[model samples]
Target: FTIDSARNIFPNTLSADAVPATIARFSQLSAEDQLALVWFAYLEMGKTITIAAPGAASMVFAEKTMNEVRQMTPLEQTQVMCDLTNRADTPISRIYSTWSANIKLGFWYQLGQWMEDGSVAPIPKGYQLSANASAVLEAIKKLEDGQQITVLRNCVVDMGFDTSKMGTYTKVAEPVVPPKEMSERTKVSIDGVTNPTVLSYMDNLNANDFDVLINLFTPDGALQPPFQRPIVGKDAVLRFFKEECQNLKLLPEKGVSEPAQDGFTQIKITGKVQTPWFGAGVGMNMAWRFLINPEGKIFFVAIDLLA
Candidate 1:
């Protein structure tokens, strides 16, 4: 992460040189310190992670790109998340800060790459991994693809986590994968509004102004809440919101919002949700990403933290 994002976690008025310097420093720190940073960064992003360690590990990664990030000691991962959050925004501004550090020598080795790049992709799609898969996280740190699998099995099984659900992981390496599909870039342009006031979006949400909230998006707007796929179009948005409004109660006064890069916004809300596999209830953290279109309307949206 950049010094600015770091400031969100904890204030710092440092210089650009600090980036590479911090990279070196993190490498020099204990693995615990580094891992803590990683965990804190994950939390800062407002991720609703699983309590099961192995599951979390599997959930955190689905490919080599993230697996590479998974390989980095938590420090490298956290900093990268920080810099990459909202194009260098303190994604955690809406919440309390508790930091951490990552373990191992791989972090030191990855420092050079981290120094050169500052981009993080979103979570992998269509994968059912644990939200707290520490073993999977540990395994990615290994250099070899086969080693990642071996490490995953041993670490989680030894810890008494169920592995039968995993079935088996198809092993592959960087060089072996088809570059055309993996390395290619795809872009799509959306109509944007002039200087959209994010406050309106948050206001409508807090007010439960379904009509106003629905107006915030285009007729074809989409939402991708946790554990669910994209709900495209204003009708779907309304239907989903109505159902969630009835099921997931939002404590508006306890919610917070922060400005994001470009026309995006980040928010954290506290509320009660169905925690058990059934109707049992529990409190949970909530994180949101509101990416508005050029027409001053919400386009792509996402929410995490589930019951």
Candidate 2:
């Protein structure tokens, strides 16, 4: 249903109903109520938009103004965008476009509020944001929007996110629909299975040829990990892995592989991590699922932590 500017509302109304009635109720809500719905779409799509909400933190993008990002040389810009995507698990190109210089200022600034990862680059002493841009900076820094989105969600007692809630209240008759990607799995049991490619992919993790590894994907591939916006393009993928290596003390030494049907491969990963009780040692359960394209390079990978 296309909403005329006047009719379309902001944050959406909370609903636990079927499509026919839910759509009807949304249509009747006042502008103020619609804000929640719009906000919900971002939360579901964003997956884990917050860094500190649940557990340990990882690579995060440092928030900078458009002028801060825009004036930099190409390499600097790429590094900044890469850092952002790594922390958020969002594709770097999607955040600032490693492919070009158009940095979609409006969208990312809003989204950044929820998912900034602080593990990468440090805040710089350069261009500053405008008063208009700075307006949201405070809220973004507070990390309240992510908390608020979650708060609104809890109000409804909804279990998991349903994808059907998307596509409404969005502008453009034909908004670009991203690839419907999976956000879970890589679970195989003891002695997971068999695939030679799984060995090579894991080997890449151990000794990745960054150039060849990044080139493995067909230029338009998508990556979905738990809580990240799909990792798209080569630069985003590379940065994500680099951050992964830094964040996770992976035990490649004890990985076990298993082959699944439909050309998928699963592997079991174990690590003896720093014990929480005064830093002893603890067992870690983790795994990776890889979906490769015909070119013998990985097109998709999903890592699972069965903790």
Candidate 3:
């Protein structure tokens, strides 16, 4: 006989009223309480003797018994069968009972295991766990045992798991928006403020200005010398620049000068310099970057020279 024909002829047999009142009562508990109760039941089921009270025997009933109990309500009954199948002695056989049943039960058990342990659950082929799951888990952990029903009700009211918990799950900090307009201008202004100070000393060699240059450098700033070990900081930079650079002079004829693109005024001077003592003329190119601060004072000056 056909499966459907035989089923109709034989008729269905279990009565919904035969289900123990404790099973009905357990369904009414909050999800957390349900979980706690199930855990207690699980411990009892595995022991040498049933530790659970006679009323709790509903927890150990056959699939047919649980299914009869489940038909009573649309809400709580949905996952009861699935939860049972997950804990079944042989999950493979129980899961193969129906496609919808298999997926539903597998999902519940995987998520349940993930919640009990702090591990990620295996998602179905195309599905993925999102940030919303983490948010729900966080909220659920805060709830007391019996309060789970209230929490879940509120969560559902807020929206499905994802939308309802968005506020709680989202990162708190504001992202840094990229600066659009005055960024380059502001950078130019900063450069102008710093370069002039360096230039002022380079243009005219003054012994006192060396102290200022030294102060501009960090405490550990190093000055490399051609024939000697590197000298560090203000005192050394002043001595080297003064002794080495003083003899150099830019000739006005054949010299080239230009300003930088960002409007920091710069001059490039290239020509020949004749040493007073040796009377030897050396071809040299010197470039200076001039910067003005917001206060209209020269903030910095950098000089580069090649001979």
- Top candidate (lDDT): 1
Which model, 1 or 3, shows the larger lDDT?
1
Off by over 4 Å in 2: 1-194, 247-249, 252-283
lDDT of 2 by residue, 32-79 (tens): 233334333444445644322211111122234444555566556546
Counting clashing residue pairs in each candidate, in order, gives: 30, 18, 13
**Roughly what TM-score does model 1 have, to 2 decimal places?**
0.29
For each candidate in turn, the TM-score is 0.29, 0.31, 0.21
Q: How many backbone clashes does candidate 3 have?
A: 13
lDDT of 1 at 88: 31
For residues 1-307, write the lDDT of model 3, one tens digit per residue: 2112212211121211212222334444444444444433333323432111212221222334334433445333334433442333233223323222122332333334443353432222343323443334444443332233223222222211222323344211111122223333111112223344344433333222344445544454444321124454556555555434333333323222234334433332223333221223223233332333233233233333321
When sorted by TM-score, best at the front, the candidate numbers are 2, 1, 3
Q: What value of lDDT does candidate 2 attain over all alpha carbons?
A: 0.36
List the candidate 3 regions with Cα displacement exceeding 4 Å: 1-203, 206-236, 250-280, 295-302, 305-307
